[PDB]
Design a protein around this ligand. Sequence first.
Ligand code: NA
Lengths: 109, 105
Amino acid sequence: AVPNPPLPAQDPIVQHLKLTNDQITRIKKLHQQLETDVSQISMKGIKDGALIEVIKSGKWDDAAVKQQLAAFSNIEQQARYYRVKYYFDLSKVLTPEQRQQVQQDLAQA
Amino acid sequence: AVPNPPLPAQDPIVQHLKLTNDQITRIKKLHQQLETDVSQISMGALIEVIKSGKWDDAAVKQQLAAFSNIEQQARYYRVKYYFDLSKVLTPEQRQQVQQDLAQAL
Ligand code: NA
């Protein structure tokens, strides 16, 4: 699973790079946009505590569980799309050496 | 989403329940079944776009869809595990687990 990117000041993948302030400025803007984008993903699909209720009731509800998990799936697919695009866009401001570093750190995850 | 459950002795969800040996034995069996079931879920482009520097939208979406398809199935079994686990518990223990899981979402 693509990682949920920390703030660049907190992200070990970017902290490991010796980035110029211009590079950091650009990556910060990218991460800001990432958070803006993911914050717009609709979460209305999730019902608060749909799974706990099934467990609490003692009666298995195949349809309800599948629906809730499908809703989680849909949201995560979208969030991860933007997380992947972030690291892709991030790589564009890097040197070839820095880029190979990121690719290695990401493949590991 | 849904916790990926450790064995009972390591699972924070059930560590304060004061499970008996018979309860542990049965829950360990459920956990063994969970792992077997998850293992039988039929299981790249994300790295290639970074390496090539060329965005492949469809490839990225395809891989993410495949991964989420797996996760949906695995999480189904994980929810079922806690559901089945709860049957082994006393009413008080069940009440605790429900509250622990609700706290974990
Ligand atoms: Na672009």
